[PDB]
Amino acid sequence: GGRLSVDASDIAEASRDFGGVARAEPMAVFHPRAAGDVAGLVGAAFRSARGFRVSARGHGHSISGQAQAAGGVVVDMSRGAAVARALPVHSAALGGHYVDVWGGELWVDVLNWTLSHGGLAPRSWTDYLYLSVGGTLSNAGISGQAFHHGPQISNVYELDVVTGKGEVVTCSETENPDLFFGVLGGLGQFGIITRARIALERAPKRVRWIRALYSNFSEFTADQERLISLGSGGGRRFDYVEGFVVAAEGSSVLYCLEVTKNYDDETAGSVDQDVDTLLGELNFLPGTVFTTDLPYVDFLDRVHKAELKLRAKGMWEVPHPWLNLFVPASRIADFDRGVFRGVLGGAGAGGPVLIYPMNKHKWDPRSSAVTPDEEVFYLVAFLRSALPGAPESLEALARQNQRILDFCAGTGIGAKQYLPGHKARHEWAEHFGAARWDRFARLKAEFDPRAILAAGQGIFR
Ligand SMILES: *Cc1cc2c(cc1C)nc1c(=O)[nH]c(=O)nc-1n2C[C@H](O)[C@H](O)[C@H](O)COP(=O)(O)OP(=O)(O)OC[C@H]1O[C@@H](n2cnc3c(N)ncnc32)[C@H](O)[C@@H]1O
Numbered sequence: 001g002g003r004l005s006v007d008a009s010d011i012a013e014a015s016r017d018f019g020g021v022a023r024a025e026p027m028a029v030f031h032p033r034a035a036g037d038v039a040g041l042v043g044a045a046f047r048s049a050r051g052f053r054v055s056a057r058g059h060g061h062s063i064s065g066q067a068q069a070a071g072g073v074v075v076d077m078s079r080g081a082a083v084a085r086a087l088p089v090h091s092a093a094l095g096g097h098y099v100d101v102w103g104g105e106l107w108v109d110v111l112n113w114t115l116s117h118g119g120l121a122p123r124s125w126t127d128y129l130y131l132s133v134g135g136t137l138s139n140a141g142i143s144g145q146a147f148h149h150g151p152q153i154s155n156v157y158e159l160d161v162v163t164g165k166g167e168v169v170t171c172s173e174t175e176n177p178d179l180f181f182g183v184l185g186g187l188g189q190f191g192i193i194t195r196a197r198i199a200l201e202r203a204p205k206r207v208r209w210i211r212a213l214y215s216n217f218s219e220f221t222a223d224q225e226r227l228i229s230l231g232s233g234g235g236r237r238f239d240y241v242e243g244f245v246v247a248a249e250g251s252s253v254l255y256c257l258e259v260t261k262n263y264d265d266e267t268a269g270s271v272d273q274d275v276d277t278l279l280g281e282l283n284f285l286p287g288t289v290f291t292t293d294l295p296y297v298d299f300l301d302r303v304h305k306a307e308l309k310l311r312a313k314g315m316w317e318v319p320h321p322w323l324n325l326f327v328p329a330s331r332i333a334d335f336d337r338g339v340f341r342g343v344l345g346g347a348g349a350g351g352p353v354l355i356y357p358m359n360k361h362k363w364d365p366r367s368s369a370v371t372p373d374e375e376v377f378y379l380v381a382f383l384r385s386a387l388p389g390a391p392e393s394l395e396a397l398a399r400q401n402q403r404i405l406d407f408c409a410g411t412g413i414g415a416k417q418y419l420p421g422h423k424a425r426h427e428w429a430e431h432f433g434a435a436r437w438d439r440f441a442r443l444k445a446e447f448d449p450r451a452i453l454a455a456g457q458g459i460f461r
């Protein structure tokens with residue numbers, strides 16, 4: 001059903017990622033038509049003498065070759081129009097809607113499909129929609145909704161997985177749960193997601209998108225932490241909570257609180273009051289509230305608009321040495337002094353520095369995802385890009401990232417890397433901890449004994 005390609009453009013694409021650093025080339029690119037084709041190719045790798053590497057590629061948004069299969073085969077999971085798509089379904093047993101999507105589908109295409117078929121949409125997002133479903137579900141998938149709905153791995157009912165033995169398995173909390181929870185946040189280690197059954201809600205029509213400035217980090221974090229505790233026994237709450245660190249030019253640094261209030265035709269009459277009520281309880285700098293009103297799709301697609309402006313300036317295809325950390329809330333204050341003011345004090349081509357807290361209880365502890373041992377933790381995202389055609393810019397950013405990691409290590413901050421870029425066995429053991437490493441290695445022994453899948457992650461050999 002599927003086809004092997006040796007087209008130089010296909011090989012070049014499969015040999016690179018958004019990070020722009022790791023460049024391991026495969027022998028060929030496989031374009032599947034359906035799940036059985038993926039099963040066939042993985043089956044052949046498993047049965048082969050050498051046991052060649054097989055990695056699925058979503059949209060290639062990896063930072064450090066996580067989707068590369070050195071001298072093996074990259075499965076181009078991007079099918080898209082040609083194949084039939086499942087319509088959203090309502091279930092009286094689940095008390096809501098779901099949709100079956102191909103593992104290679106992009107979230108932007110999923111959104112467009114569910115909106116045009118019942119005005120439905122997933123409840124938990126990423127900031128960027130040009131990512132595959134299989135790709136984000138292999139990590140966590142987080143944005144401003146995760147504090148309330150949990151990550152995208154907490155909003156999936158079932159999967160079809162092609163294991164490292166080329167077997168197709170349907171799994172959920174009730175059927176083959178070890179494979180289901182193993183795959184979720186599993187870094188592609190136990191199989192290729194060919195189908196994901198995504199939870200849906202009735203989509204809002206519009207968004208009231210707010211930004212407010214803070215000079216005091218203690219007031220900023222206290223407000224972020226109070227906002228993510230809202231929504232217990234009904235109660236007024238924002239639908240999205242993010243934040244970012246800003247340089248004063250163009251205190252020494254400012255913190256931007258970013259919130260949204262989702263609304264439709266029924267709630268349009270109470271949106272202005274709900275926003276004013278929630279904002280009154282906050283301690284942002286007076287006269288720094290910036291408001292926008294726009295369609296739900298336009299809000300969710302905001303980062304794609306930033307991308308088009310970057311492509312127009314030749315600033316998109318540059319190295320992206322992006323570092324993502326999960327920081328226990330008990331150590332966030334020290335993080336500001338030492339990193340935002342310390343390491344970063346005094347940015348290459350520039351880029352955002354995201355910061356926002358999440359609730360651990362919205363993350364299922366049975367999944368493979370690694371979070372800090374604290375109820376409240378922050379994502380701290382260093383999304384700074386190198387200058388185009390300037391290798392020294394990438395080196396300076398890489399030294400800054402190592403200084404941030406050294407700062408966390410040296411002060412005993414129990415931070416965990418999100419999209420971990422570890423490569424040494426002792427680094428992976430430390431990342432997971434004894435209990436989780438033991439569950440991870442056992443799942444690997446069972447579902448990918450020859451370590452065929454997602455070898456670019458550099459965990460097993
Ligand atoms: C580039 C980027 C990434 C990004 C983002 C914005 C941009 C500009 N915003 C994010 C956000 O707000 N929140 C978040 O949680 N992540 C965000 N990211 C990072 C993104 O999630 C990751 O890059 C992730 O890898 C998904 O991207 P993509 O779909 O392109 O996947 P990949 O890089 O090719 O593959 C990643 C790993 O997973 C394995 N893989 C790929 N597809 C599958 C399937 N179907 N089944 C199993 N494993 C799969 C790859 O082999 C690799 O190990």
Ligand SMILES: NC(=O)c1ccc(OC(F)(F)F)cc1NC(=O)Nc1cc(Cl)cc(Cl)c1
Pocket residue numbers: 127128142303306307310322324352354379381383418
């Ligand atoms: N405001 C944003 O949100 C954003 C803006 C610009 C942008 O720069 C780009 F235009 F170049 F794309 C990227 C953004 N956001 C993310 O990229 N978010 C993210 C990325 C990873 Cl790798 C992990 C996690 Cl958790 C979040």
